[PDB]
Design a protein around this ligand. Structure first.
Ligand code: FAD
Ligand code: 6X5
Lengths: 666, 133
């Protein structure tokens, strides 16, 4: 994907098409002739290209126009409208750049942003870029929110967001050019090591992996073509579907066994009547035989009745024995047809024992990817964001992912250690109430024209509430938060003296001994240049591991990865840290997931800003005062950092469009 | 619109597994019972089989007797019509079961032995007491 169109792809827009948003902004173009919207499309993704070839500097309207050409540079009022459209919604001139034109001397309007997570930093950074004053309010003593790197000495390991998922169509493909981000590459191959400590053979790996995958598309079949969705008036989760396709497959294996042995017997007793008819054919071969020979011992001469008797009974033996022989060959074609019907037994079991704790390992890292047990994931919608996943391959950030938010926080006033306990909004304005989180008596009152809420969805689910809204949020939002899922997954990072593992493998797994513990330290990660290994606790294990001590968790670590590489082959780590995200009051979880009974629409519902009621009854209805960003907001890029900053960018654009007006709709 | 591999999923069973909580276990368990059931039926029938398979030891070979080699003869001496009318008295219209007892007459010259020496041998009168019984 290159040319002026490669910008359109990289910017997550169609090329030959026109999105609903630019339709709202450019209704004349979309309702007009085909040619005019074609030229508009060109102008759009062209200026996109110019921004994408050098993200490290702001491109102005005077930077583009002269680099267009007829008959595209002919209409300037339109290229002004498209440039002033794109920077507004953060498709161009976003993130970190050096701006040629120094900022407005006086700001316009006021918004305060709750929380310094990357979505909040994007929103505030571009709102400042737009000529508004912004202030950021953090409960934490540091920025970055759910991107958190551990840095001690040369040891850096991130407990938050680690890998970027593809660079194709990634907004952070440009920030990786804006900030110093050395993107290394994970290596896809994962060896699975059993509970004994020695690796699983390759044939078993392939067998269980393809089986696993095919159970997944089995579930997809259940949803889409069989509409197996509600059960007992309750929505089904892909955990339940996985167990029902597993059960159906085991069931089949059984009933094909029975189908096989039924026909081996039903050809076998069809041998009964035949050789019963053989025994009671033979005994009369004997009786008639001594009849014949006692007839032939009558000695000549004979009257023709006796000669008749001997020759007739002679034929009666010489047509009887042939109906012994032909069905010794009819028999003879039956009884040797039972040992090949024996020699093709159907598979003894659908699935055996030890392999279930391997396929359980695959299920486990599935529960890791979604940060929740498969019991909770909506079967229909859990993969809904898979269509929008990027191209290229997943890249780790070795110097730590905290380099990007601290890079954004440059130039903004972040007020750290101030926890917002109340958000108060009406038609005249907003005032939020904060508390210094060190000395909790000290209270702060901020007033502004709008507030943008980056609060993680876990803290919004908190009951009794950590942040009170006056007036309370409307039911349609609060219930959307209630039915949305929030997952948990945690990392144990271990710091040794040197590498006792294979430097070639970046990640290696360990299969648990039961379905219940399948998420317990199932895979380990060597992605870092220091002697750093970090194992992931996920699934339902992550929730249980938080309330038990750290030294027993690292104890279970070293226990596991001793039997992997040998007992003396491991040191004991200099220092270790474990994450507990669900216990974090500023997280209350890890990232979101669509729960059973939820859907993608809920994300949409959580993006919708909230307008107050009219102050004086009978007044013109007020302006939306309260806005929402964060990973739980962007629908088709949820639970990612790129999705977060995309939300922050778009609602920086929406805040601006409301309080600065939109001059690009002419 | 089809399962990805040799997995089988279609409506009629999934409702049988979802009928209640234990429908899975109760649906595979009586299948296991019906499996070992017919399996013991097998081993039973095997064991009855080997018994009369033992009863068939030696085949019929002591009761086989050498086959007669002969050439078909055109005419008749007087014995094989006295043989013939007796053979059709016991047998009737089964001719290759007559051609054999005579033995020097192949099949087809037994049937033209049904329309010529007839009212002499009174053959249709001897043919219906093979029909009476
Ligand atoms: C273990 C883990 C691994 C992850 N790995 C990846 C990954 O590999 N790739 C990826 O794309 N994404 C990953 N993510 C998810 C990603 O980190 C998040 O989606 C994103 O960083 C969240 O940004 P945010 O601004 O939306 O939320 P946050 O970063 O949580 O921002 C919210 C901020 O508000 C503050 N706050 C909370 N309560 C209050 C309060 N009462 N008053 C004032 N301030 C408050 C918080 O301190 C926080 O700083 C991972 C997440 C976890 C937990
Ligand atoms: C392609 C297989 O690569 C294996 C591998 C190795 C090392 C790190 C990671 N990957 C990671 O460490 C990782 C990447 C991302 S993005 C959000 C979380 C997260 N995690 C844990 C991976 C797997 O990559 C993904 C993992 C989870 C995931 O989730 C899908 C989205 C997130 C929630 N909603 C659907 C997507 C890719």
């Amino acid at each position: 994907p290159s040319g002026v169109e490669g910008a359109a792809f990289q910017s997550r827009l169609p090329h030959d098409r026109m999105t609903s948003q630019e339709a709202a902004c450019f209704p004349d173009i979309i309702s007009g002739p085909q040619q005019t919207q074609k030229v508009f499309l060109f102008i759009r993704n062209r200026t996109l290209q110019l921004w994408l070839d050098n993200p490290k500097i702001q491109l102005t309207f005077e930077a583009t126009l002269q680099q267009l050409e007829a008959p595209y540079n002919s209409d300037t009022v339109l290229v002004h409208r498209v440039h002033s459209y794109l920077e507004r919604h953060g498709l161009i001139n976003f993130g970190i750049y050096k701006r040629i034109k120094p900022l407005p001397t006086k700001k316009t309007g006021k918004v305060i942003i709750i929380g310094s997570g990357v979505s909040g930093l994007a929103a505030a950074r571009q709102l400042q870029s737009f000529g508004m004053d912004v202030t950021l309010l953090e409960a934490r003593d540091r920025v970055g929110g759910r991107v958190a790197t551990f840095r001690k000495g040369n040891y850096v390991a991130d407990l938050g967001a680690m890998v970027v998922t593809g660079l194709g169509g990634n907004p952070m493909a440009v920030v990786s050019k804006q900030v110093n981000m050395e993107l290394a590459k994970i290596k896809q191959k994962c060896p699975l090591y059993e509970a004994n400590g020695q690796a699983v053979p390759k044939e078993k790996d392939e067998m269980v992996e393809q089986e696993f995958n095919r159970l997944l598309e089995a579930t997809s079949y259940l949803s889409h073509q069989l509409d197996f969705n509600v059960l007992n008036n309750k929505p089904v989760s892909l955990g339940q579907a996985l167990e029902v396709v597993i059960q159906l497959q085991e069931k089949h294996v059984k009933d094909e066994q029975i189908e096989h042995w039924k026909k081996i017997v039903k050809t076998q007793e069809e041998l009964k009547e035949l050789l019963n008819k053989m025994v009671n054919l033979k005994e009369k071969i004997k009786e008639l035989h001594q009849q014949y020979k006692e007839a032939s011992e009558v000695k000549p001469p004979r009257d023709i009745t006796a000669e008749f008797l001997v020759k007739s009974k002679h034929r009666d033996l010489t047509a009887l024995c042939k109906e012994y022989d032909e069905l010794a060959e009819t028999q003879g074609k039956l009884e040797e047809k039972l040992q090949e019907l024996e020699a093709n037994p159907p598979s003894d079991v659908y699935l055996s024992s030890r392999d279930r704790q391997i396929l359980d390992w695959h299920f486990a890292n599935l529960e890791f990817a979604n940060a929740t047990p498969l019991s909770t994931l909506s079967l229909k919608h859990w993969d809904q964001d898979d269509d929008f996943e990027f191209t290229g391959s997943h890249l780790t950030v070795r110097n730590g992912y905290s380099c990007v938010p601290v890079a954004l926080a440059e130039g903004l006033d972040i007020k750290l250690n101030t926890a917002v306990r109340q958000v108060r909004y009406t038609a005249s304005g907003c005032e939020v109430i904060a508390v210094n989180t060190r000395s909790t008596s000290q209270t702060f009152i901020y007033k502004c024209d709008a507030v943008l809420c980056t609060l993680p969805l876990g803290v919004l689910k908190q009951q009794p509430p950590a942040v009170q809204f006056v007036p309370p949020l409307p039911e349609w939002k609060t219930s959307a938060v209630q039915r949305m899922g929030f997952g948990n997954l945690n990392k144990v990072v271990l710091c040794f003296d040197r590498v006792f593992w294979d430097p070639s493998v970046n990640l290696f797994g360990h299969v648990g001994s039961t379905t219940a513990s399948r998420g317990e330290l199932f895979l380990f990660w060597n992605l870092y240049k220091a002697p750093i290994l970090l194992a992931l606790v996920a699934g339902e294990a992550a929730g249980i591991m938080e309330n038990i001590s750290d030294d027993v968790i690292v104890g279970r670590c070293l226990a596991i990865l001793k039997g992997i590489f040998g007992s003396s082959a491991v040191p004991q780590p200099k220092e270790t840290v474990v994450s507990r995200w669900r216990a974090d009051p500023w997280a209350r979880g890890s990232y979101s997931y669509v729960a059973a009974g939820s859907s993608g629409n809920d994300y949409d519902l959580m993006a919708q800003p909230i307008t107050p009621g009219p102050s004086i009854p009978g007044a013109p209805q007020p302006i939306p005062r309260l806005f929402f960003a964060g990973e739980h907001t962007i629908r088709n890029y949820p639970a990612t950092v790129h999705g977060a900053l995309l939300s922050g960018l778009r609602e920086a654009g929406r805040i601006a469009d409301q309080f600065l007006g939109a001059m690009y709709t002419l | 619109r089809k399962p990805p591999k040799g997995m089988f999923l279609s409506q009629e069973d999934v409702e049988a597994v979802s009928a209640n909580a234990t429908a899975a276990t109760t649906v595979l368990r009586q299948l296991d019972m019906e499996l070992v059931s017919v399996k013991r039926q097998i081993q039973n029938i095997k064991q009855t089989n080997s018994a009369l398979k033992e009863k068939l030891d030696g085949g019929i070979e002591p009761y086989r007797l050498p086959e007669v080699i002969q050439k078909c003869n055109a005419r008749w001496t007087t014995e094989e019509q006295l043989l013939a009318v007796q053979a059709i008295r016991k047998y009737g219209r089964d001719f290759q079961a007559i051609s054999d007892v005579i033995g020097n007459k192949s099949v087809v010259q037994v049937k033209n032995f049904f329309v010529n020496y007839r009212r002499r041998f009174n053959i249709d009168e001897v043919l219906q007491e093979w029909e009476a019984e």
